[PDB]
Structures are given as structure tokens and as C-alpha cells.
Design an enzyme around this catalytic site. Sequence first.
Site, mmCIF file in Angstrom:
data_model
loop_
_atom_site.group_PDB
_atom_site.id
_atom_site.type_symbol
_atom_site.label_atom_id
_atom_site.label_comp_id
_atom_site.label_asym_id
_atom_site.label_seq_id
_atom_site.Cartn_x
_atom_site.Cartn_y
_atom_site.Cartn_z
ATOM 1 N N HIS F 4 0.807 -1.206 0.000
ATOM 2 C CA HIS F 4 0.000 0.000 0.000
ATOM 3 C C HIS F 4 0.838 1.252 0.000
ATOM 4 C CE1 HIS F 4 -3.210 -2.604 -0.069
ATOM 5 N NE2 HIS F 4 -2.886 -3.034 1.096
ATOM 6 N N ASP F 10 2.639 5.987 -5.759
ATOM 7 C CA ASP F 10 2.642 6.083 -7.195
ATOM 8 C C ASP F 10 1.765 7.261 -7.638
ATOM 9 O OD1 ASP F 10 1.946 3.482 -9.704
ATOM 10 O OD2 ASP F 10 2.713 5.453 -10.000
ATOM 11 N N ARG F 13 -0.416 6.873 -11.187
ATOM 12 C CA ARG F 13 -1.595 6.034 -11.037
ATOM 13 C C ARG F 13 -2.725 6.736 -10.304
ATOM 14 N NH1 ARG F 13 -2.800 4.596 -6.759
ATOM 15 N NH2 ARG F 13 -3.910 2.738 -6.013
ATOM 16 N N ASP F 59 -13.277 -5.546 -1.451
ATOM 17 C CA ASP F 59 -11.931 -6.114 -1.564
ATOM 18 C C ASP F 59 -11.797 -7.393 -0.751
ATOM 19 O OD1 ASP F 59 -8.951 -4.680 -2.398
ATOM 20 O OD2 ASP F 59 -8.776 -6.345 -1.052
ATOM 21 N N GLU F 88 -18.727 -11.672 -6.043
ATOM 22 C CA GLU F 88 -19.696 -12.752 -6.248
ATOM 23 C C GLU F 88 -20.300 -13.351 -4.972
ATOM 24 O OE1 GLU F 88 -16.135 -14.941 -8.402
ATOM 25 O OE2 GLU F 88 -17.418 -16.553 -7.722
ATOM 26 N N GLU F 103 -8.830 -0.106 -9.655
ATOM 27 C CA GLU F 103 -7.420 -0.180 -10.013
ATOM 28 C C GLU F 103 -7.138 -1.698 -10.166
ATOM 29 O OE1 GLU F 103 -3.326 -0.263 -8.335
ATOM 30 O OE2 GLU F 103 -4.089 -0.803 -10.265
ATOM 31 N N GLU F 112 -1.202 -10.475 -12.267
ATOM 32 C CA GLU F 112 -2.319 -10.774 -11.343
ATOM 33 C C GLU F 112 -3.293 -9.591 -11.349
ATOM 34 O OE1 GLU F 112 -3.430 -11.082 -6.817
ATOM 35 O OE2 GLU F 112 -2.549 -13.004 -7.292
ATOM 36 N N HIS F 254 4.673 2.158 -10.354
ATOM 37 C CA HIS F 254 4.944 0.905 -9.651
ATOM 38 C C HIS F 254 5.036 -0.332 -10.548
ATOM 39 C CE1 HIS F 254 0.494 -0.609 -9.068
ATOM 40 N NE2 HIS F 254 1.172 -1.715 -9.091
#
Lengths: 320, 328, 321, 320, 318, 319
Positions: F4, F10, F13, F59, F88, F103, F112, F254
Site C-alpha cells: 500500500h 505512485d 496512477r 476487496d 460474487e 485499479e 495478477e 509501480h
Amino acid sequence: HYGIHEEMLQDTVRTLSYRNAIIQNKDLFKDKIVLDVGCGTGILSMFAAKHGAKHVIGVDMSSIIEMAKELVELNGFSDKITLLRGKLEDVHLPFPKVDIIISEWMGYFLLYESMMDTVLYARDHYLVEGGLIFPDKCSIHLAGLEDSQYKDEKLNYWQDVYGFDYSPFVPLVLHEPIVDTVERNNVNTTSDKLIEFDLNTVKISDLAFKSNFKLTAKRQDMINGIVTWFDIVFPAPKGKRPVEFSTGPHAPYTHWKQTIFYFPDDLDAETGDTIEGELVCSPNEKNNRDLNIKISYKFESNGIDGNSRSRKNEGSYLMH
Amino acid sequence: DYYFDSYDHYGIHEEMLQDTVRTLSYRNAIIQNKDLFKDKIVLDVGCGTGILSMFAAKHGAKHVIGVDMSSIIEMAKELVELNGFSDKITLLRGKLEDVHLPFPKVDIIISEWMGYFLLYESMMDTVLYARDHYLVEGGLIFPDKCSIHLAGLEDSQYKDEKLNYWQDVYGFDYSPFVPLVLHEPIVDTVERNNVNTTSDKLIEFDLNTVKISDLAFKSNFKLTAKRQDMINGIVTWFDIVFPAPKGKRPVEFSTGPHAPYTHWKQTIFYFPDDLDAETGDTIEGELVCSPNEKNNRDLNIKISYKFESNGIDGNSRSRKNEGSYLMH
Amino acid sequence: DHYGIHEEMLQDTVRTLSYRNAIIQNKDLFKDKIVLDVGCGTGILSMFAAKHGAKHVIGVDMSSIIEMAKELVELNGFSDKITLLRGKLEDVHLPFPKVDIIISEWMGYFLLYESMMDTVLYARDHYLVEGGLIFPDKCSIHLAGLEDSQYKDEKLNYWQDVYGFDYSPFVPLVLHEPIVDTVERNNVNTTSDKLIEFDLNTVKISDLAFKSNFKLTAKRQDMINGIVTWFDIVFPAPKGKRPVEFSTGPHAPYTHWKQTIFYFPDDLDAETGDTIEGELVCSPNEKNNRDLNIKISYKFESNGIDGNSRSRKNEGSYLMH
Amino acid sequence: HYGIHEEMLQDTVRTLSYRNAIIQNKDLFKDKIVLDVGCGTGILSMFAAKHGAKHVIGVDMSSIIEMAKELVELNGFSDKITLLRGKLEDVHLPFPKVDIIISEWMGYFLLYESMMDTVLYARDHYLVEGGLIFPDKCSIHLAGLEDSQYKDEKLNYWQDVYGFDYSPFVPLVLHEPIVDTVERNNVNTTSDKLIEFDLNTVKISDLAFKSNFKLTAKRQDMINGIVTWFDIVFPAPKGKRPVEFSTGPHAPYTHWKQTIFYFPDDLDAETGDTIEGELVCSPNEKNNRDLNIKISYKFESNGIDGNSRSRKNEGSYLMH
Amino acid sequence: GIHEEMLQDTVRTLSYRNAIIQNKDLFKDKIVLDVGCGTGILSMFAAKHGAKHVIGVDMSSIIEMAKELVELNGFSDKITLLRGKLEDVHLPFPKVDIIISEWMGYFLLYESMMDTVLYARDHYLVEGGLIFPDKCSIHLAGLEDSQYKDEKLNYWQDVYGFDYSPFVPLVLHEPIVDTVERNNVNTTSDKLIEFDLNTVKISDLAFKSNFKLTAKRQDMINGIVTWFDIVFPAPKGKRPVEFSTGPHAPYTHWKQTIFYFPDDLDAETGDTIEGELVCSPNEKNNRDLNIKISYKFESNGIDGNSRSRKNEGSYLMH
Amino acid sequence: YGIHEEMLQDTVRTLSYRNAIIQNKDLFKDKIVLDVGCGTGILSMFAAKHGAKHVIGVDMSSIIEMAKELVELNGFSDKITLLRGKLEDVHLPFPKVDIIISEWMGYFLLYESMMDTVLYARDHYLVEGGLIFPDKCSIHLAGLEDSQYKDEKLNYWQDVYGFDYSPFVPLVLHEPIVDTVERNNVNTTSDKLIEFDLNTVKISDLAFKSNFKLTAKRQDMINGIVTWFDIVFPAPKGKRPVEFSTGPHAPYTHWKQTIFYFPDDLDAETGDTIEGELVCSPNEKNNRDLNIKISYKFESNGIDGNSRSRKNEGSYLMH
């Protein structure tokens, strides 16, 4: 001149301290009229209006007001913030009774080219009696400094300047206060508080002060002068601990750094040796925007060669 | 107690005197010309602590008139008495336009008149007033020749962080600052390895012939890239040359990145475009300089450029633009 | 003769351990043998020989420290095996004219500076059994381009004003002064090259006054202010075994020999790829054989953009003393 | 070599003291004749000639006079300064009688590789009786030094060296005088004066001295030995305070640094304890440029742990 | 591909090479085991010096590499290798005379194969057998780090305008692995504990140790720097090869483990810190370490009692 | 904080999401926002701050518990709802979302990458013509000069402190390396490999195959292809879209870039061309890992005539 604004905005200790004070008092801001004395790019006016405020009036006698107007529109505050270019005395405020006054007024020895006069003018002429001032309390401090290497280099230089003797510059250099950040490890006495000011009650007549002080040597070293600085305190709601900050050597970097005053004698100190003295600070008669400083000290020691080390003297310094 | 009757900020005169390139270049010039100094009247325009006046008197001169508008003249008076020159040096407090000189005709005029981009807070103006009103026609001016130069600079790392600060200041968007910073000329010492183009000479001034109208100049220049690098703007500077007797090499010095340190450092002017250059590529352009309308003490600078390349990508990397900058 | 100098050579771990780990690799060549230590000083190398097996070690040196060495060999259990003689090897009565192995710490600051090489050759010429081993046996001088603009401009500009006086005539003199100092890797900005190599088994005194050529090519853009010089050392070895070797250069760990810097009269503005082709000659002089006349000549050539304005050809004479 | 000239000229304490002294005395210089013994680059001769002198005669036995002649031409003093190559004793001086003699004769422990000798030959042979020497008075001094951390590195290294016992080196190191600058805070005792020399009266025999000292401890520390130094004093007109300077630790840096001698015992000391003893200094028989120094002492402790810390010892040292 | 960083660490690689060579005559007609084989060099360097036959253990696709390597440099007949945790895996041999292992990690004990090297001496080593290395120890001293902690903890006050302050205690409790330059060490360095592999029984690794540091100069002691020292075996009377991972020793990939104190301590020369550090591998994950530091900082100087402080800090190596 | 502190520091971003959201503040105003993979809650907070009726930050990491604390402090508790776990499974306080901000981007864009979860959200929760932040992305490559560094990690295994350790060199030459490729070390014409539009793309399209041509800029060694991605944001009618690049020719993000070293250290000249094919697919052993394969052909038409005109294949596994 944007540079002083990049320098002031990049001092996170300063700006975040005002930010955090305004957030701690957000509900006191909620539907109030705010005056920003010396607004600059309008950053503190935008914090006030960001955390709820009926309207903020930001004033400054500099060109950056035109920039700050562009900034206040870009960040969506054009309706809540009015910025007036000028000196507070020459400016007609749209709401003559202000609830809160916020100002980054402080100068190098707190009082050096400070806007304190203009802030007390603001409270005396537009603030509602029990009104909030940000910050409202401050104090000036000192301690002994070890600076042998640098001070001897600065004074040695004038003995021969390209062959000519430039000795008359040596007292001139001792009479000059230096603004520089001192390494903590070079502070070698205990610290003492000279004076304190409450911006709710203080009158301009109390800024010309005279104070007593005592410093005790923390370790064996030379004391070449004193390092001075100031601390700041902000208003707070009932019960909560207030946001505060310090500009001294024992605290993180601030653009105010510290102001060094050199003594006439280089004192040879052992642990426990003691400097008792007096500092007077007064605006100069010829020019009130300059400061006449005088430092008197009695360096009293006793240990084996104590009397050959003991020294009493005074110095007058001019800041401008 | 000590009464404060004096301005003296010692720091700024310490900075002037500790510039060995600057002071030793006036000293060496006077030494090379000592015989030409021998029975003459010398005028020190902007004497400060009187050091150049004292160099002159030391090296044989009938009399030196040191003139300056700053309180340092009373300290400078003290230094003249201490070094044995009270009878030969006369110091006057005030601007040359105003003060009434002891000797109606000066043979030699010495002056540290130079400002930051040569002409920025310069006293060139006051030196020209002095040769036109007090110098004996073929009289010597120290220094008498100067020239402004430039070249391309690689500053990508510092330029990028100066500009990226303004995108978020404590939550607020401060983007309008970016055009202000891109047009503030910076006075800094540039590392020589960051200079990545050939240099060019914009203008020359011979102080023996130059009139004030010419200081507002318009000039064209061309720069070829020495190596593969981002050119972010230009670094500018000036060179000074002193008068010299028949057959001796003239004393001279440069304030450019390729020379040792000097307090005038260099003036950087940033381009709006960061140019991607390859060895051989080019910046042809124009720089115009003029004191402006609303204040003749501040300098308006304009720089126009056309960066061109041929290496494959050639057209995708070429670009032209213009910019106005103000020194204040 | 003062402990300092001897503490120094003993605290240089690279020097002494390189002679240690070399003698250890040759201990089987040592077991039966007789060995001669030229310039033995505190006797450390001799004791290393004895410690690793040898019938004898005769150690020689012209300085008072010899006396201190005698207590040390008594004290360390080597008194019978190690014989020490004070004075000059040339005339001091060597008690065994047929030596199998000869060790010496002869090396000086630019390899040859106040170097015992002349006395080590005299010893192989007069006492070594033909295919007898020298430690070390091969040495070679090397050089590269140095960046040192900040320190050099300070050192020379100081002489412009000395308490008001002009001491300008001192600048040509400092410039012809080879300084001994350790150069940080990062100030080396060209390739390194080999000037001269010497094989101690074969080299004659005549050859030590040499003349050699070098090509350096710039690795990056920089100002080249002179050359930084040094030496590499190699020890004899048995077959199958790779020799113990050390370097005294800026790209290698600290050695008391540091590096020897020579300043050029021109400060060369270089771009990657540019080159310095030159010549260095070296000869010990008449008015003092222990002092060295070094001369460096070069042509800095550049084909890049401004080439001929930047390119320089020049000569410089230096004096080590 | 250039090196010691850079070191002597860059020493601003040294050069500026001769400068200042000549300026103070400039009226007694004015139309006189002066000899500069050991003139080197000619700097002092040039100070004399710059401040008024009918003639400076500069002597030195080193190749540098061919350079100093060029410096005097370059600097416009060629009619007034005459330089001569050789050892003073036999060289033919243009003037039989000299009014003033200046020289930079001092060595590391004042008397170490000093040209004092040559200066005394020059006054006895060429000076006009009441003629002035620059400088004419000098004095050696000493005090106790705390050096524990460095001394134990230097005496313990010799035990295991690569597996070898190098212990006999220890007495050899312990009797090596070191020249090094000592920091003020490591001087842990009062300072005493050993001897003083008046260059106008002193005969060569007097340089082989023997004198006492008492050293009282200023604070709790280990005294590992003594730091010695010298003070210089220049002639002055009556009414005028003399130009002077010190090479000791509580004075600014100078190229002569100090000369430390280490004790065989590391003395444990409380505030007030005392080192009383003797130092004897004599040129060596085989080579009179070398110095035989011996130091003898008794440390008596009056600070609680008296007898356990009390020590008596002797040490001979050689400077070469 | 990380294994570069392991073999590129000369003070590790060479230290083992030279440490095996000093004992060569004791490797001679004997058999060895490369526990925790980080590519094969310890088994390869071991075999090449007399030792009649070696065995290597690594639980990663890296032993598939080690097998190939043993062939590119000849070794194949003397060197046998495998995929797996030595706890229960078997190559062609029953017992072993010398175990050679590159086991340690960060606080000496973190992602370490120490238990796995203890498994091997307890099961296949000939009682008075040689462990490379056999002795190890963890040390600490005080640290000055004020500017970096003040800037590292100031970042979270303003993230794109928002206050992220709940991150400050979290990072204060993060033990950082980095190289401390020697000059930031500002106290006497102490010894927490020392291990000897030939005797140290598994449970012994969950230690509770007391320490004492005295201040060497005035400074702000912001926390502790820990590190370790390694010592190898040797024949009767000669110098054991040995190295250290500490601030005042040449670089090591293990670097040092910095632990920040909750209080930034103001100290004068001679002030003392007396503490107790405990280390217990934890319940949920036996490769993750619970580190707790208790300390008492005392001062008898000028304002001594006001500056004196005691406190506790729990840390988690994970 | 690790991952984090790097993400939030960054600036390219985070500031791209901030500026795209402020550009679009009218279209957020009284809408419902889904923050896919919210982490600390910084983009949710950007949404609430710029007028949102509600934001659902989702998340699956413990970090949600911090996001609730940070959401309180800055004044957003009433507007931001945070749900711990996968989309889901965990279910939303509102049936349908008007805007999804996420993001999602991985190392070679698709490494990933939460692409699949984001698409799950527009297919199950977004209102048809709903806005996706960001909405367009593209993979890209160029030629690389990495000689010194490559010869370091190559030649070293030839004599690993005495021994020959070289069967490593093919391994190292094929495990893709993530690094900031210095601008000056690029030597071919940066070509567009492939692009996706988040409004329209369906998971199946991620297993791609692509067409490339690389003209060489100078005479130097083309050691491998350096590859990277560019992002673009939804923008209002007639407004410049907010965008950014992970390219070597652009500031440090990053993600930096993914380097693909060639078997053959191609010696090139100004004007000659590499042409060929890149194929990328996920793995059976593990659906998160990426199977890359590079088919290059080097037409060295120039100073060599036709002599060093080589052609080679490459199979690389991202892990």
C-alpha cells in the site's frame, strides 16, 4: 516570488499543523465568517471553506492573489472565498464582523518580519470578542549553542582579504543574528522560556520585551552563543488536547529554522556550569520593522580553573 | 550599549569577496595594467567595501573615487583608513547621477557592474553614464567587454519533481502553478555533464562603444546535440574580458558551467517541451531581451525554438514552440 | 626507523596475506628449502617461510628494525631457523650463497619509486639457483583516465593570492607533482590499459628505465584531468594451481600503495567513445638515482560533434621525489 | 618539494602573527635592514619590504631560493629584497650590520628540527646589540591527555598478528612521541609551563633543559599521557600589547599540532588528583638533530580511591 | 530468480569455501551433507576437497538445477541430490560425518533452516561430527535514525488530501531489514545470546534475553539494531574462519534487523538502556516470529530524571 | 504497509484516477459507485468527495478493516460502504451500480490482474451504458539494449567462484524480468500489440496473438523486447480523456515494465527490422500464471548486407 510559496507549502510541519487545527475545530467553523490575514496562495482559506464555513475573506498585499483566485475557482470555492489584494487597513471587508481569524503571521525570531501587528489590528477591529484566532498562543525560547568550527572560520576570514586587513568586519559579524537550522547535538545547555504571548489578550506594547534566563550546561563543550526559536499553540474545543508545533533544534525541520546569536566571549563549559542573563527585544526607533536585540550574560563556573573560565559580558544585535 | 547606525548585511559582501574568480580577475587585470594605472584618477562605480579601489591605489594611482549608494561606504571608509589609503581614496555615498565628483575627469573606470543574466540587476547603465560624462575619450574600462551565451541542458529529474508537486497540494489541485514555474528563470550552478549541446554566443558588448539602446537585443542561435539526451531548456551565462597592454594576453573569465564556480552561477530557462534528442539533432531559435514597460529594472526574455531531428522517429520527435519569461 | 611505517605494511591485509597465501600454496616447494628475504623489516615474511617449512631463512635489511626482528624470531619459536643480518645486502656478507627461493617486499609507490627491485635483482643474479623462485615474480604498471576537477581547481587556484602576494609560479610546480592518494572507483572514467609488465626471473636493471604507449577510451561524458596509475602483482605457482595475485588499482580493495595520480596540463572535455592515446616514459635520474623522471605525452582525439575544438595534444614532465 | 610550503603558508595563525607583528612594529621597521633566516618562499621578507625597510636579506639552504627570487620580481620587491642560497654561517651577506632579524625557526615540540641554532648564530654575529628578533620569546607547556580508545588499539594490535606474537613492538610504540592535533575536550588537566626562552639572551647550552611540572586533574577521566606544545611571543613597542600565538589544544589549528607522549601507566583520575614530575630534554650524541626526551612522574590521588590509583613511573623517548 | 543474491554474497560463499578448506584433512575419507542446498556449491565445494561422497537437500525446483550442475562440472559420481523437506525424504545414504549448511535468516532465526539442520545432526551425524558453521550469536546496539523515521511516519498525515494516520503504529511495529551505516550506532553493543549447533536443542530457540547498552556520545536513540556473528570449526590450536553481519563489518545480504522504539530517546554520553528482548515463533505460522522489546532508559546527568523512560514494544516478523 | 505504501506513493496512477474522476464529477454526482478492489479506500474516497450518492468499496484482504477506519476519519462513513471478500460472494446494498471504478491492472497488464472480477461487475451489476474507470487499455513493446546487465547475470554462472554453474543462464534468460528500463536503452519503433475496451471485452479475448514490427533506431545490440501498457479513461462529450503510460518513455509507475530477453543478442543497424509474433495465455497448472511465447525474425538489411539476419522462438513463464 512563487518560491517563498513553494517553500511555505512544502513545510509540512507548518501547513499540516494549520490543517489539523482547522479539522479539530471544524464544527466551530461550520457556519462562520473567516478572515485570512496574509493569505498567500489561499491554501488556509481553502482549508477553512473545505471544512465548512459561511465565507472566508482572504487578504494579502501581494500579486499571488490573482493566482489564488484561479486556484479558488479551480477547486470549486469561488462562491465561499473572496480574496482582497491590499494591506488590511486599506481594505473594506464585505462582512465587517468576522468570527474566526486565521493567519500564518510568524516571522524568523517569531517577531522578525511578522504580521502580528496586522493580526492584532484584525482582532481589535473585526473579531467578535470571544472569537477564535489560529494560532493564538506562542512563545520564544533559547539555549546554548556549540558552533566553534563555523564561527572561527567566519571570523578568521576578515584578518586578510586579498592582502588588505579587514578586521573591522569582525564585530559586524558578531552583531548579526544568523537564521540557520542547528544540529540538535550542538545544543549544549538546558533550554529556557523567555516570553509568551496570548494573541487573545496581548497588545502591541507588550511585544517590546525584556526577559531573564538561566541555562545549565548539559555536557563539556564550548558555548559560542545562543540558539533561539519559538513554539506555537492553536485554539481547541473543550476538553481536547491542542494542535501545536515547535521551531526549535529538538524538533523536525521547519522553514523558520532557528536564529543564532553569537556571544562576544567563547565560553569554556563543564557539565553543570551556568549561564544566567537577560535578553531584551525591541522594535528599532529609526525603523520599527527592524529589531534591536541585546543579550547580557553571566557565565559563572566553578571547578578547578573555574575563575579563569568565568565570564560576564553583553552584546547588541540588529536584525534587518 | 552599541547604537545601530548602519545597514550592513555583512553576508552579501562576504559572498562578493569570497568569489575568487571574480575578485582575482579584477586584481590580475589591474596588476597587468599597473603602469597604465600609475598617475591616474580612477572611478569605482559601485565600490561596495572599496576592495577594487584599494587594488587600484595599491598599484599606483593618483586618486580613486569610489562611489556606491549603500551604507557600506562608511565601513569602506574605515577599511581605507586601516590599510593606509585614506589620502589616496575618496569615497562617496549616493548614486553617480546625483553625487558631485571631486575630479571632473576620470582616466580609468573600474566597476563590478555585472548582474545575473549579465544584464539583470546590473549597473551597466551607470557605467555607461560614467564613460559618457567623465572618461577621457580613449580611457580604460574595467572590464570593457562582455558576452552572453547558451546551450541545451538536461534537467529531467529536477524539472519533473518541481512541476509534479503542484498536481496535489494537501488535496487541492494546484495545476495553474505549473505555467508560472516553467517561466521563472532559475539562477543555479548547472553540473557540466548535464550541458548536452554545443554552445552559442547570442550577443557581445564592447563597453567602449555600446549605447544604452543596444542592451535591448534580439538574437538568433543554433545548438547541435552532443549526445543522446532529453534537452529540457537552456542554460545561459556570460563571459568577461578585460583591457590589456600591447602584447600581453588579456585577463578574462567565464561564468558558464564549463568554468569554475562564480556567484552569478548560471540562469536556466525551461522549455515548455521536454525535447527527446539524439546525437546530431538540432535547436535553431531566437532569444529576445528587453527591460519592460511597467518596470525598466525587470527583464523580459522571450525564447522561440525549433527542434529538429532525422533519426527514423525524426518527425515524431521534432517540435517548435515559443515562450516568454520574466526576471524579477 | 619508527614503528608507524612497519605498522602500516602489517595492517595492509591485502599485501601481507597475499604473501602468506602465496607461500602456503608453495609450502611443498618449501619443505626442504633455503630462502632469502630481501628488505625483511620486522621479519614477518621470513617467519611465514619458516612456519611453512624450510631448512633456513636469511633475512636482510639496512634499518634498525632488524634488531626488533631478532627478539621476534626468538619469541616466536624460529630463532634456529631464521638468521638476520643488518645493512646493505650487496656488501653484507651473506651466510649461504646458494638460495633456492627468494622473497622480497620490494615494491614502491608507482611500483618502481623508492623500490628495492635493484637489490632483489642483485640477489637473484648473485645467490639464486638458476630455476629458483622469486616472491613475487611478475609485476605490471597500469593506468586510466581520472576525473578530479573539484580538487585540482582548488589546489591550483589557491596560489593566485597568498596573503596578498602573487604565487602564480607555484601552479606549474604543483601540476608536475605526482600525488599519491586513493582514487574512488567512480572518478575513473576511461578504460584501463597495461603500460609495462616485468618478469623478475628475466628482467635486467636496464629495462627499468622504460618507454611505453597506452590507449584509454572514455566510458562516459566527463572532464579527464589526468591519469591515475597503479600496479598488479603475481606470485609463482605449481602447475594445476592458479597464482595468488593482487592489484593496487582503484577497482580493487585498499592497499597502502594507494594510486599515483598525474595531472595533465589540459583538462580534457570528453564524450563516451573519445580516446586518449599517449606515451609514458620513466627513467631514474643522475642527480639522484632514487628519484624518478616521468614524462607523459598524449593526443586526446574526438570524432563526436565538436571534435577538433575539444581534441588536445600535449607533453608533461613530472618528478617523483 | 612544494608541500611544507603549502602547509606553512596555509597556516593562517602562523603567517598572520608574523604579519600583524610586523605591521605593529612598522615604524621600527621603516628605513632599516632586516635578515630573514630560513626565508623559504620569501613570504616574511616580502612582508618586511612591503611595510618599509631599506633592505631585506633572505637566506635558506634549499633550492626554493631560485623560486623565491621570481616571487620577489613578480611581486615588485626586487630592489629591496636580496636572496642568498646557502647555510648562513659562511654565506656573504651584503650588510655587515643588521637591525632586525625575522625567522620561522620553530619545530614540532618547539625545539625539534629547529633552526633556532642558526637564528642565535645570526644575532651573535650580525645583530646591532638591542636589535629586534621576530619572534623573541617562546615557551613549552604541557597537560594531561585522555586518549584511551586510540592508545589501546595501538598497543593491543601487536598481540596476534596473523598468528604471530608481536608483543616486543609494544614498548617501541609506547616510547614513540606522536605529533597529532588533540581535541580540547580530551585535555583533562590543568596546564603547566615547562620552560621559557628569551631569544635575545638565550645561549645554545640552555636548550638542553630539565624542568618540573604539577598537573591537577579537572574531571574524572583516564590520563594516558601528556600533550605538549609551545607558545610564541613577538616584540612590541612599549605601550602596545605584543602579537602572540599558541600551538596548544585550546587554541586554533596550527601546522605544528601537538606532540603527545604516552605514559607507561594509564592513570585513573578523579577531580582534583595530581601528577607531579619532571621532563628532561637533550640533543643526541650520535646525531644532534635528534632529541632525547625523558619524562618522570608521580600521580598521587586525593580522590577517595587514593592508594589503588597512585602511581610512580619513568619513560625515555626519542624524537627522530 | 533470487539465488543470485545468495551466491553473490561473497562474505557468505567464500567464508564457507575457505572454512571447508581449513578442515580438508578432516574431510578426507569421510562423508558430508548439504542441508538446505541453495544450488549445490556447499556440496560441490565440500566434495572437491577430499571428502569421498556428499549428499544435498533442497525443497524447491532449484535442486533440479543442482543435479545438472554436478554434471557440467564433472562431480556426478561423488554428488547425490533431491527435491524435499529433509524431515522425511531419502537419498542413497544411511549416515554422515560432517553437515554443511547455509541455514540462517535475518534475525538469525526467521526464515531459517535451523530446525532442519538440527534434524540432520540429531538423526544422521556421527556424534562428534562437524557442523559448518557450528557457532552463532545475536547482537544489538542502539540507533540514531531520526530523519528517516520522522519522514517515514510523516507521509501518512497527507495522502492526496486524506489523513492516513492509523498507519503510524503499524509501521512502528514493523521491524525493518536494512543496512545501518556504522556511524548511526550510538551505544555499546551487547550480546543477547549465543548458540552452539553441536549442543543446541530445538526448544532453546524460543529465547528470552536481557541486555545492557551504555550511550557512546550524545544522540537520539530511536530504536535497536540487531545482527549476528558466525564462527566455524578448526583443528587444535589454529584460527577459526569467522564473519559477521553487523553495521561495523563489510556488507552481508542478511544486513541488520532494525526495531524502532515507541519513544525517541534523548541521550547523553553514558546514559544507560537496560532491557529484555523475547523471541517466540508463533502458533498460526511457525516460520513467522513474535519479537517483544521491554526497556528502561536511565540518566544521572543534568536533567536526567525528566528524560529517563521505560516502555514496551511488540513486533512481528512476517 | 508494504504494497500500500508503494501503490499510494505512485503519483501517476493515483492522480490519473483523481483527475479522471474530477473531469467526470457531474456524472458521479448523485450516482452509485462500485469500487472493485478498493484496498485502502482511496478511490472510493475520491468518488464520495466528488459527489456520489453512495460508494461500495469491495476487496478480499484484511485491509477493508482499515478502510472503514480511514473512511470514518476523513468524513465519509455515511457515503462509503465497505465489504470484505469477493464480489460474487459478498452482496451489495444496492442492486445496480451506475459507475465502476477499479485499479485492476497487473504487471504485464494481464499479470495478477483483476480484469476478470471487473468484467464480472459490469456483466452483473453495471447499468448497460454505465461508466468503467479506466475503460481502455493497450499492451505495447520495443527493442532493448541491456548488454552490461545481461552479461553480468550470464558470465557470472560460467565461473561461480571457481565452478561452472551455467545451466542457469537459459533459466534466467526466460523468467521475465520486471524493471524500469532506462529511456536511452530502447532502440526500436514502439509498436502496438493489442488493445482491450472494458465496456465490450469478454474474458475469452485475453488469450491473444499479435502482429509486430520493430524498425531499429541505431547501431547496437537488440538484446530482448521490453514490453509495457497504456491506460485511458472514459471522458465526457468533447473533453480530452485522462490517460497514462507504464512505458520506459514515461515516468516511473509501480508497474515499471516487463523485459523479455532474446536468446540471440541481435547486432543491429539504423534502419534494420525485427518482425514476428507474440502469444500470451494463462496456465493449466494454475489459472493465475501467464504463458508467454515470442516468435522473432530479424531482417538485418544494412551494414551486414544480409549476414547476421537471424530468426528465433521464446517460451517464458511469468510467476
